[PDB]
Amino acid sequence: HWGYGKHNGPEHWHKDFPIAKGERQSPVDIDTHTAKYDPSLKPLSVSYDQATSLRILNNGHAFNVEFDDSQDKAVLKGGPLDGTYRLIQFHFHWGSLDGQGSEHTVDKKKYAAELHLVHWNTKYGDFGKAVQQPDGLAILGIFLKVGSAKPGLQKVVDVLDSIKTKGKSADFTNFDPRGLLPESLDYWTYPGSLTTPPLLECVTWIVLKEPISVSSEQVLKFRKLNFNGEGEPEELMVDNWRPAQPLKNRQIKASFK
């Protein structure tokens, strides 16, 4: 019964998921004055030419755009990573107001939203195996600010009416996730966790330096989604973000000078 409400939000998750107070929790604040350039980091390689989106699902916590992950169709490699990571889904976290919504922060700045492209390490065979490994997942995080529209987001926005409530899904084929990337692939990286229960410490985080812009109308449509199921009292799906967690015995590395 975890969520982001008045009585089940992030500050409560530790009771059912005690690693919520663990050593490698996410998100974190990225202090640009202490993250150090690491010349041993490599560019990242984002290979989404062959990506097969399938479906979009309102899971009661966000919406997931799901991919074929039964071959090396959409992969993330390079950067800080060893080996190959398959795209399984992407989703967002966003606010009720434009001054909040991101999970990671940059010098304490909150963005309006944050996109997570979730990938699993093919050495482990399936996502469920991967999440049990410290190097099982690679999550590419991209900040959203409100300004111009993002054309590549509009087909996501326009399907949201069909998945308003928890448990609804819709066919969502032929979506190109390249349309959600910023110009630059400069990034910060650190070891952390899933930001939702079960909060497993299985993630190499790769957070892009450059935000994307979305319009105020696009974010407004995110904010019309519902946490609740059909026929239940309406609870707008807003503020579905976990706040920054203690960095502890970690360093954030920068790919850029």
Choices 15-23, 44-52, 114-122, 160-168 (CB under 5 A): range interacting with Zn ion:
114-122
- Nearer to Zn ion among residue 90 and residue 172 (C-beta): 90
Cα three-residue angle 40-46-52, rounded to 5 degrees = 155
Where does this chain touch Zn ion (CB under 5 A) — which range of 2-10, 45-53, 116-124, 154-162? 116-124
**Residue 116 found at the interface with Zn ion (CB under 5 A):** yes
Q: Is 168 in the site for Zn ion (CB under 5 A)?
A: no
CB 92 to Zn ion: min, Å:
7
Residue 183 neighbours by CB distance under 10 Å: 8
Residue 46 to residue 99: CA distance in whole angstroms:
29
Distance of CA 129 to the CA centre of its chain: 20
C-beta of 36: minimal distance to Zn ion in Å? Answer: 26
14 labeled part of a ligand binding site = no
Residue 196 known to bind ligand:
yes
The residue among 197 and 229 lying less far from Zn ion, judged by its C-beta, is 197
In this complex, which beta carbon is closest to Zn ion, that of residue 139 or of residue 160? 139
CA dihedral 80, 84, 88, 91 (to 10 degrees): 20
DSSP per residue, 138-151:
EEEEEEEEESS--G
7 is known to lie in a ligand binding site: no
- Contact between 242 and Zn ion by CB under 5 A: the answer reads no
Cis peptide before 177 (omega within 30 of 0): no
If binding means CB under 5 A, how many residues of this protein chain bind Zn ion? 1
If you write DSSP's letter for every residue of 153-187 in order, what string do you get?
A: GHHHHHHGGGG-STT-EEE--S--GGGG--S---E
Active site residue 61: yes
Please indicate if the annotation marks 12 as binding a ligand.
Answer: no
Cβ distance to Zn ion smaller for residue 36 or 219: 219
CA dist 137 and 163 (Å) reads: 27
Which one is catalytic: 7, 14, 61, 104? 61
Segment interacting with Zn ion, rule: CB under 5 A, options 33-41, 109-117, 169-177, 216-224: 109-117
52 is in an annotated binding site: no
